[PDB]
Each structure stands twice: as structure tokens, then as C-alpha cells.
Design a protein around this ligand. Structure first.
Ligand SMILES: Nc1ncnc2c1ncn2[C@@H]1O[C@H](COP(=O)(O)OP(=O)(O)O)[C@@H](O)[C@H]1O
Ligand SMILES: [Mg+2]
Lengths: 96, 195, 239, 568
């Protein structure tokens, strides 16, 4: 990891390696990679708290591999949960 | 007014220490002001006796007023001799007296608390007994004497009260309570006896 | 005490819509709240730069130094100290109004209700934000809290003035939001044609010409007229 | 020589004769703040003059400008002046505008007397020959260097002084060469002022346990940057501790016993007041020997702790509450499992003082607490003066920390020391990760331009702490050759930098022939020469000579000229 990270253009390799079997969509791949790595959660003096995770919304026409990218992210991410449309209630999403 | 509220009818403990510091104490001088047969400035004080100060001979015990003994002990120019009552044997004897007679106080000197505090602070290395034990016996005497006082403040009538052998600091700290509860129990009595 | 944060329908305030359409809360629930703040995104460049520079300082570790320096300077209080101070004030002081304070509170409540009445009469629809006796008690409580934080046993007129200002800045501001039309159009056209582009006319003269005349304020929004001489002169700003 | 070791009592008696009058306060002690050694020396002097009821005034002075201003403000009644921690490397009579004809009384009869005596008391070796040899008002408390290693300089100075053909001119140049080679020398430190004043006290006979403890603190203040001096002075302290400790050993502990002890004092960071893991992690020496700044260092530390058989839960426990099984086996465990990692130098002997029931504390920890209290205890030419005012104020916090009745202040100092070491570690890993230190063939520059808590480094003591961290890290790297380092830190409010030219040092515990010869800090002369020409708004006023304040825009040309300068 430390050896390949020092490479110039590692970000481009990582982005290009998100959905290898999905053509194009480099903006979506960039957004998904940024979400997968996430940000740093700040906490100012123990009082102010800043979110440190990046949310992504894929909005587009049908048959553009939006669900396939989500399935890939489920495959790749450490702790991933998949919930769809009407099959996810308010208390099942958060807590009951 | 001229005199603050907390100094109205009592003495601040600093004033009690001031009063105690005027009592003579015995010291071993580390200097010698005795002029030989064969200049120098003499003390010639106005509120005490300068005779014992102009005739100090090193390691020859004299008696000087306490506030001067402390002044010399500020340097290494004297060595305050602890009073005989401030030894472990005598403190144990007084503690036994207190534990044996639960109705009256022991015959400790009126300045025992103030003198003990002053000597422990300023002359901590002039005791033939370990100071860590003298402190532990002074505290024990204080505790026993406090127990006897709280069981006698249960006799606060309106006529009088005999606090025999009580020290000066203990009396000073009990003054604003005793002398203001007895005043009220006297005002009630005189109001009743208005016939 | 209930500190509730809400969101108007459609997310943004959408001031084009009526003030009653944005707020879905009933009048009954809205009457309990002493101060009803309606904040808005100004989208002001000079303020946006300040907010951005503050947030970036928050992120880049500068807060942990600046806040500590301010707190040690004496211009701030740590949480553990403000909590103790709040408890002490709540268990030590319960201020009550002075008669001069009560006169001010009564005379201000009457003014507030009169303003609400004229707004309702103009709009011919009950205001979404209500002003009731519970709001007079709200101003009383704000005054007493302002006195309490100073541990003052009696609330002077300074606290009344500040409580009135706070109420005007929160609930009156919430209630003052605004979205006949033929009269407005006629007034705009006649003053545009009559009053020249570069000159000014006094407002008593426009009154003689004739109402509430919100058209002048609307034009002031469009920067075509400008009231300058303390409202006694209406000057066509150049549009 | 001016005042040798054997004649300190003469200086003390002269001071007593001149200014031991209860009528007024004719004695003024000028102490250099931001110097623990000077702080302990002035505490010794304060106690000694309190015993003899000599009225005195103690003024903390930060820079030479403050010294000059105070001397100008100084009244003529004050006929005894003590300069503690400075004044020995500059022409004080010239700096203060002193002419002996205006301070001389009763000239007659081969003797001379003066109406004011200035006693300089410091340890920086470049003694100004016009002070140690050519002035009677200025009286220097020498430590024996001048009477043994300045014979040639003495002859060269006196010949030029007395002499005001071809052979005469040639000999003058030869002698003037001897004076010149004496100058152009880096400023080092050979002794500790606390040890010098303790020697004076031994001469007078006022030595006691408190004075010995102050001596130990002053000497231990030198162990970080001048370990040769500390190792030279250690046997004397070891002998004094044995001499002064009462014979009633192995007695029961009582709430009054004060015990100076020589027991294993491992060279960790606040071992007794923090967890064992934090003592290793934040130690300068352990960091240098393990390179904890990188990611692999923490793994090495955890592996070491597992190797010793100390659980991480026990290792991270506070030292007071660590289980008595582990805490009593630290010596054996360290013997078994320290030479593997090269940390054999961690084991060491130090002085530990326990005051009754208040728990042990070592001199190494005590001086860190004092230093922390000095550092963080509490348009451009005015805010800087506010910083100087706060820095002077912190001297009294560190002074009050010495009193046994203010342990609640020493604990605050300990907490501040832990926080400052944490900040230093964070900035060090930030510097070594971004590779901010630009290697050169003259000096390894390093400028702090941006980051967190950058306001800590406007204090010279904190900047020197960070520099010592970096220098310890670099000293244990064999590849990196020895080279002076420069640290700078931009002060945004004043738009000025704080350049602190440092000096390299050999690895700790490495004793060789070249190690015996001390390293000399040449930055003072370079800075002064560069500032003399090419006016750049440089402020050279610190008693620490190798520290200047330079404008933000003028920093780069200054460093360019310094690179062109071959003095250092
Ligand atoms: N850019 C692309 N490259 C490869 N396959 C794609 C691409 N876009 C869409 N597909 C294919 O379209 C099929 C259906 O995609 P789908 O998951 O239905 O997307 P959406 O849910 O957005 O309609 C997938 O099997 C996927 O292989
Ligand atoms: Mg889909």
C-alpha cells in the first residue's frame, strides 16, 4: 500500500478501478471513490461536531448502471447495507 | 465605623497571637552581646526589659520576650527552648488527665494552642521530641477539649458559667456563640420578669 | 423549556408564497412558543465570505486555539462554568417587575396587538403567527430572565427594553412576513408618468392625489423611488 | 581571572559591606527569565539574603534592551547590581554607557573604590576580555576557566593595552591575532550558575537540603543540551547528597521527612506523573532511537511492551495506580529487555525528593514542570512588548512553583508540560512527514509557515524545545552528518519571524574523543555581522544570542546572505 500510494496519479488509478466492468461514468466513479474513502470527522473542543462522511446521490435515466454501481459499493465497502425503495420503512432504516 | 464588624466584641486570631507573643520565653543565644571588660548599640526597648538582651552569652539560656525570640530565630542567632509542658511525657500526662476527669479541663497554660502553633512553625528543629508526635498529641488534646466544650455548651443558662482552665484561643473562638446565646436567654428571662 | 427546531414546507421559506402556507403548525401549537425565529439564507457575498473564512478556521484546527485564547482572555465562559452559573442563577434569583417596567410592557403589548390587527385587516386573513396574552407573558418571562442573569432582584426598564427588542426581532419578525393589485398598478403608472425620473415629490402631495400605500415601499424595493428626508420626500432614484 | 572559586566569599562580604543596610534597599538582582538555571540561582540568592535580612529587588529581564532601559532608570543610590544568567559576553561598560570616572569615590595609596558594583553571574564561556580583564566596576564570578585557559589572551590583552618599529608592529599584529582567534568562537556553557552559587554557600556555610535541591534543579536543567556539563557536575551533587542526608536511615516515614535520594531515575518523560506508555512515547531519546514519528514506530513500541510482558492496559495505567507487581520489577524488566532496542541509556541514576506523604518526584520531572510554567504559565512594536510582559510574568509562576507550599502550582506545571510535549510531538511529526527541513551544505533550514498552534513557538523556550526534539531525532541518524539547524516561526499578528539558530550534538551516551570537544554555536556572530550591514529590521536583544526576530519579507534575503556568510 505504501509503495503504490507514492505513485503519481494513484488517485486516477483508484478512480478508474471502481467499476471496472462499467464503461464511462468517470464523475460517478470519482464520487463513489470519494464516498468510499470518506473524510475526517472533526470535533471542535468537544462541543462542535462536523460530519466526516460524504453522501452521494446518483440521479439519471434508466439503464445507466446506477444500481450496479451500488451493488459494487456493497461488495467493496467494509460495512455496507443495501435497502431499496418501498422495501425500507422509517424505523427499519434507523432504529426500532 | 472606625472598628470593623468582625472586630466588634472579639479578638481576631492574629490579635491572640500578638498577645501571646508578648510572653517571655527561654532561649539559647547563638550570639554574645555581653561587653567584655577590655562601639556597639544596645537594645534599650520601652515595652520590655533589655537587661537580658544586652547580656546574652552564647549557649547560656536567658529569657526574652517571645516576639524577640522569633525575630532572632528568623536568622540562626538563637534557639528557642520548648516549654516543659510541650514534651511528649507531659502531653501524655495531660491527655490521661483529660480522659480520667470528664467534667473539668486539664491545667494547660492559657496560650498552649497559640504557642504550640508558633513554635511548630518557626522553631521546628528545637524540640527534643519528634515534632510529628508533638503535633499528634496536641491534636488529641484539642479533640478531647472540644468534646468536653460541646457537652458543656449544653449548660448555657442565663445566670453565669464557669469555664475553668479553658485556654485563650478556645475561649476566643467560643465567645461569639456563648456570649450571644446567653444574652438571648437573659433577655427572655428579664422580659418574663417584668412584674 | 422546549427548544424546538423546525423546517418550513418546501424546505426554503419561499417568501413568494403566503406566510401561512410555509408554516404547517397550527395556531394552538405556535402560540405556546415565546420566540419564533424565522432565519433565512441571505446569500450576501460579504457575509458569505465571512462565514466561509470562519468555517475554514473551524476545520483547520484554528478553533482549538482561538476559542481557548478567547476563553482565557475573559470574553467567553467554558461549558462547565456556564452550567454552574446557570444553576446558581436559577436557584438564587427570581426577579419581579417594577411598576415602570409593567407600564412599558402593557403599552408595548397594546402596540403589538394593534399592528397585528391592522396586518390581519389588510390581508383579510388570520395571521399564521399569533400574538396573544401568552406572548405578553412571554415578554414578561424574557424580562425576568434578563434580570435573573444579572442576579438583579427587580427588573428595571433596561431589561424591558431588551426583552421588547428580542420579541420584535423574533416573533414580530416571523409575523411580519408578506407575499389591491389594480390600485398598485394604477399608482405605479401614474407616479411614473407624472413624477419625472430625476426629480422628487413630497408624500403629503401623493396622499392628496390618492390608503396604506404599500406601493411606495414596493417601488423602494425596485429602487425606482427613495424616501430620503425622513420620509417627507419621495425621490425618484433613477429607475 | 576576576573572582575565582576560592574567593567567592570575598565577593559576598563585599556585597554585605556595601548594601546590607536595613535603612533602604540598595541591592538589585537582575535575573534573565527563560532560564531555569538563573531562576534557581536567584532563588538561592533570595533565600541567602533573606537569612541575612539584606533588602534586595529581583527584576526579571528578557532582553538586552530591557536591561539597558532598566539601568537607565536605575537610581544612583543602588550600589550593588547582580546580573544573573547574562552580561558575560558583551562590553557591559560600553553597552550600559559606563565610565569609571563617574562611578569612582576615594581614589586614594594603591587602591580604588567605586560607588556601584556590578557582579555578572553567568556560564557562557566567551568572556568579554574588556570585562574579565579591563574593568573594575564589572566583577565576574569566574569558575576557574580564565585563570587556567586565558593566560595567552591575558598577555595579548595587556600588551595591547599598555602599548597603545617593524618588530613592534609585527608583534602587535601577532598579539592582536591571539585576541581575534579568541573571538569568532561559538558560545557554549561550561558550568551551572546554581552550582557556582552553591559553592559560594559552601564557602559561607549556609548549605542545607533546600539549597542542595535548588542546586540539583539548576544542574539538571543542563542535561538536555549540555550533557557533558551535567556529567561533569554530577559527582559533586552525589557527594553532597550523601553528606547532607541524616544518619537516621531506614526510619519510618513521617509527614515531615524530606528525603533527597539517589535512585534509578530512567530517562523517560514525566514517568511518575503519567503512564509508562506515555513516558516512552513522548521521550525525546526513545523517539530518536525508535523513530516513533513515522507509523512503524508505534508498532515498534507496542512490540517492545509485549516483549517485556507488560500488558498495554497496565502500560497505559497512571503510574500511581500501576499494579505493585509490575512497578516493583521495572529495574529487572528494563535490564532484560532494553539492550535489544538500543535503549540501554534509558536506565540512569537521578535525584528523587519525597516530602512526607506527597509522593516522589525527580529533578528531571521538576525542571520540566518549571519549564512548562515558564513557557505557557499564563502595531508590531507594541504586541511584541505585550508578549515580553507575559513572558516576564511567567517567571514568577515558575518562581512560586519552587515553594513547597504551592504543590497545586507544580501539578499545573506538570499538566502544562505534558500538553506542550504533545504539541511538540505533533509539530515534529508534521515537519518530518512533509520533509520541511531543507538539507543544505551549510545548515539544515526549517521554516514553519503554517499549521496548528503556531502561536506556541513565538516563545523562545518552546522553539528551543522543538529544536531539541528535532536535533535529538537527527543526532541518532548515522546517515545525517552533523550540521547546524535553523528554526523559524511566523508570528501573524506582528508579521515577524523568530529565527533560532541551533547547534548539533552527538548521540547521548556516546563518549569519544571528538565527543569530548564541545560543539560551539556560531550563529551569534553570523547574525550580528549580517545585521550590522544591510539593515533588515532585525531585533538582536535576546540573552540567548542565537535567536532573532526578523520581518516576514526580510527573512529570505537574510537567509540568502547567511548562506553567503561563511562565519558559521
Ligand atoms: N456504462 C456501462 N457500462 C457497462 N454496462 C452498463 C453501463 N450502463 C449500463 N450498463 C448495464 O445495464 C444493465 C442494467 O443496469 P441497471 O442496474 O438497470 O441501471 P439502472 O438501475 O440505473 O437502470 C446492467 O447489467 C449493466 O451491465
Ligand atoms: Mg435501478
Amino acid at each position: 500500500f505504501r509503495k503504490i500510494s507514492r505513485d503519481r496519479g494513484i488517485i486516477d488509478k483508484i478512480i478508474s478501478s471502481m467499476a471496472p466492468s462499467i464503461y464511462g461514468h468517470r464523475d460517478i466513479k470519482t464520487a463513489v471513490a470519494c464516498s468510499l474513502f470518506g473524510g475526517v470527522p472533526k470535533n471542535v473542543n468537544g462541543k462542535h461536531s462536523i460530519r466526516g462522511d460524504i453522501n452521494v446521490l446518483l440521479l439519471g435515466d434508466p439503464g445507466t448502471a446506477k444500481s450496479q454501481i451500488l451493488k459494487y459499493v456493497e461488495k467493496t465497502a467494509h460495512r455496507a447495507v443495501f435497502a431499496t425503495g418501498q422495501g425500507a420503512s422509517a424505523v427499519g432504516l434507523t432504529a426500532s | 465605623m472606625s472598628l470593623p464588624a468582625h472586630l466588634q466584641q472579639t479578638f481576631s486570631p492574629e490579635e491572640i497571637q500578638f498577645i501571646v507573643e508578648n510572653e517571655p520565653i527561654k532561649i539559647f543565644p547563638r550570639i554574645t552581646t555581653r561587653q567584655k571588660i577590655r562601639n556597639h548599640t544596645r537594645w534599650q526597648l520601652i515595652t520590655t526589659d533589655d537587661k537580658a538582651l544586652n547580656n546574652m552569652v552564647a549557649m547560656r539560656s536567658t529569657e526574652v520576650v517571645l516576639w524577640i525570640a522569633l525575630l532572632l530565630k528568623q536568622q540562626s542567632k538563637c534557639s528557642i527552648v520548648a516549654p516543659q509542658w510541650l514534651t511528649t511525657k507531659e502531653l501524655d500526662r495531660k491527655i490521661q488527665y483529660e480522659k480520667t476527669h470528664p467534667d473539668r479541663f486539664s491545667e494547660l497554660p492559657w496560650n498552649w494552642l497559640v504557642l504550640a502553633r508558633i513554635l511548630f512553625n518557626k522553631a521546628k528543629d528545637d524540640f527534643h521530641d519528634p515534632i510529628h508526635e508533638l503535633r499528634g498529641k496536641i491534636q488529641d488534646l484539642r479533640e478531647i477539649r472540644q468534646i468536653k466544650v460541646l457537652k458543656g455548651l449544653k449548660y448555657l443558662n442565663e445566670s453565669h458559667l464557669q469555664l475553668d482552665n479553658l485556654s485563650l484561643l478556645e475561649i476566643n473562638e467560643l465567645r461569639p456563640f456563648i456570649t450571644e446565646i446567653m444574652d438571648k436567654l437573659r433577655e427572655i428571662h428579664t422580659a418574663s420578669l417584668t412584674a | 423549556s422546549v427548544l424546538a427546531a423546525a423546517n418550513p414546507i418546501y424546505g426554503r421559506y419561499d417568501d413568494l408564497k403566503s406566510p401561512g402556507d410555509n408554516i404547517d403548525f397550527q395556531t394552538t401549537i405556535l402560540s405556546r412558543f415565546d420566540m419564533i425565529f424565522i432565519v433565512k439564507d441571505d446569500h450576501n457575498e460579504e457575509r458569505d465570505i465571512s462565514i466561509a473564512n470562519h468555517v475554514i478556521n473551524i476545520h483547520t484546527g484554528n478553533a482549538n486555539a482561538m476559542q481557548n485564547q478567547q476563553e482565557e482572555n475573559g470574553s467567553e465562559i467554558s461549558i462547565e462554568k456556564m452550567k454552574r452559573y446557570i444553576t446558581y442563577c436559577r436557584l438564587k434569583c427570581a426577579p419581579r417587575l417594577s411598576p415602570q417596567a409593567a407600564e412599558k410592557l402593557s403599552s408595548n403589548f397594546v402596540t403589538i396587538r394593534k399592528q397585528l390587527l391592522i396586518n390581519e385587516l389588510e390581508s383579510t386573513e388570520r395571521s399564521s403567527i399569533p400574538i396573544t396574552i401568552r406572548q405578553l407573558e412571554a415578554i414578561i418571562r424574557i424580562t425576568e430572565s434578563l434580570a435573573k442573569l444579572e442576579l438583579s432582584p427587580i427588573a428595571q426598564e433596561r431589561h424591558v427594553d431588551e426583552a421588547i427588542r428580542l420579541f420584535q426581532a423574533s416573533t414580530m419578525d416571523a409575523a411580519s412576513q408578506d407575499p389591491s393589485l389594480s390600485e398598485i398598478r394604477r399608482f405605479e403608472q401614474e407616479l411614473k408618468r407624472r413624477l419625472p425620473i430625476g426629480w422628487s415629490t413630497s408624500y403629503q402631495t401623493l396622499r392628496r392625489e390618492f390608503a396604506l400605500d404599500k406601493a411606495l415601499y414596493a417601488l423602494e424595493k425596485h429602487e425606482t423611488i427613495q424616501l430620503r428626508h425622513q420620509g417627507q420626500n419621495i425621490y425618484r432614484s433613477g429607475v | 581571572m576576576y573572582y575565582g572559586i576560592s574567593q567567592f566569599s570575598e565577593a559576598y562580604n563585599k556585597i554585605l559591606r556595601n548594601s546590607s543596610s536595613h535603612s533602604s534597599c540598595q541591592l538589585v538582582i537582575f535575573v534573565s527569565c527563560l532560564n531555569i538555571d538563573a531562576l534557581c540561582a536567584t532563588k538561592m540568592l533570595s533565600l541567602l539574603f533573606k537569612k541575612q535580612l539584606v533588602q534586595s529587588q529581583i527584576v526579571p529581564i528578557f532582553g538586552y534592551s530591557e536591561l539597558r532601559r532598566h539601568y537607565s532608570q536605575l537610581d544612583d543610590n543602588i550600589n550593588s547590581l547582580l546580573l544573573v544568567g547574562f552580561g558575560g559576553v558583551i562590553d557591559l561598560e560600553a553597552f550600559l554607557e559606563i565610565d569609571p570616572q563617574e562611578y569612582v569615590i576615594d581614589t586614594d595609596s594603591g587602591e580604588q573604590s567605586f560607588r556601584r558594583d556590578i557582579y555578572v553571574l553567568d556560564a557562557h564561556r566567551p568572556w568579554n576580555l574588556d570585562n574579565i580583564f579591563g574593568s573594575q566596576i564589572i566583577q565576574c564570578f569566574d569558575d576557574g576557566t580564565v585563570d587556567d585557559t586565558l593566560g595567552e589572551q591575558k598577555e595579548a590583552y595587556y600588551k595591547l593595552l599598555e602599548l597603545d618599529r617593524k618588530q613592534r608592529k609585527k608583534q602587535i599584529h601577532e598579539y592582536e591575532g591571539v585576541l581575534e582567534e579568541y573571538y569568532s568562537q561559538g558560545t557554549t556553557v561550561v558550568n551551572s550558575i546554581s552550582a557556582q552559587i552553591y559553592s559560594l554557600l559552601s564557602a559561607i556555610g549556609e548549605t542545607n537540603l533546600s539549597n542542595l535541591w535548588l542546586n540539583i534543579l539548576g544542574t539538571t536543567s543542563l542535561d538536555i543540551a549540555y550533557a557533558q556539563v551535567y556529567n561533569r557536575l554530577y559527582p559533586l551533587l552525589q557527594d553532597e547528597v550523601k553528606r547532607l542526608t541524616p544518619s537516621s536511615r531506614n526510619s519510618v516515614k513521617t509527614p515531615d521527612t524530606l528525603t533527597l535520594n539517589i535512585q534509578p531515575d530512567y530517562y523517560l518523560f514525566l514517568l511518575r506523573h503519567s503512564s509508562l506508555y506515555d513516558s516512552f512515547y513522548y521521550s525525546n531519546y526513545v523517539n530518536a532511537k525508535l523513530s516513533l514519528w513515522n507509523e512503524n514506530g508505534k508498532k515498534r513500541l507496542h512490540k517492545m511492551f509485549a516483549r517485556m510482558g507488560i500488558p498495554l492496559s497496565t502500560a497505559q495505567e497512571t503510574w500511581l495506580y500501576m499494579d505493585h507487581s509490575i512497578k516493583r520489577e521495572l529495574g529487572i524488566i528494563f535490564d532484560k529487555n532494553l539492550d535489544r532496542y538500543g535503549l540501554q541509556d534509558i536506565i540512569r541514576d537521578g535525584f528523587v525528593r519525597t516530602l512526607g506523604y506527597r509522593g516522589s518526584i525527580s529533578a528531571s520531572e521538576f525542571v520540566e514542570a518549571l519549564t512548562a510554567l515558564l513557557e505557557v504559565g499564563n502595531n508590531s512594536a507594541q504586541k511584541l512588548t505585550n508578549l515580553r510582559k507575559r513572558w516576564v510574568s511567567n517567571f514568577w509562576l515558575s518562581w512560586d512553583a519552587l515553594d513547597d507550599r504551592k504543590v497545586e502550582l507544580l501539578n499545573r506545571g506538570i499538566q502544562l508540560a505534558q500538553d506542550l510535549q504533545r504539541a511538540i510531538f505533533n509539530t515534529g511529526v508534521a515537519i518530518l512527514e512533509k520533509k520541511l527541513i531543507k538539507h543544505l551544505r551549510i545548515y539544515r533550514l526549517c521554516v514553519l509557515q503554517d499549521g496548528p498552534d503556531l502561536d506556541l513557538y513565538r516563545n523562545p523556550l518552546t522553539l528551543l524545545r522543538l529544536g531539541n526534539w528535532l536535533i535529538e531525532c537527527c543526532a541518532e541518524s548515522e546517515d545525517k552528518q552533523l550540521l547546524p539547524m535553523v528554526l523559524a516561526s511566523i508570528d501573524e499578528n506582528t508579521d515577524t519571524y523568530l529565527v533560532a539558530g541551533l547547534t548539533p550534538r552527538y548521540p547521548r551516551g556516546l563518549d569519544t574523543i571528538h565527543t569530548k570537544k564541545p560543539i560551539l554555536n556560531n550563529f551569534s556572530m553570523a547574525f550580528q555581522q549580517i545585521t550590522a550591514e544591510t539593515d533588515a529590521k532585525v531585533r538582536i536583544d535576546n540573552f540567548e544570542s542565537s535567536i532573532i526576530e526578523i520581518r516576514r519579507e526580510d527573512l529570505s534575503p537574510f537567509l540568502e546572505k547567511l548562506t553567503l556568510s561563511g562565519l558559521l
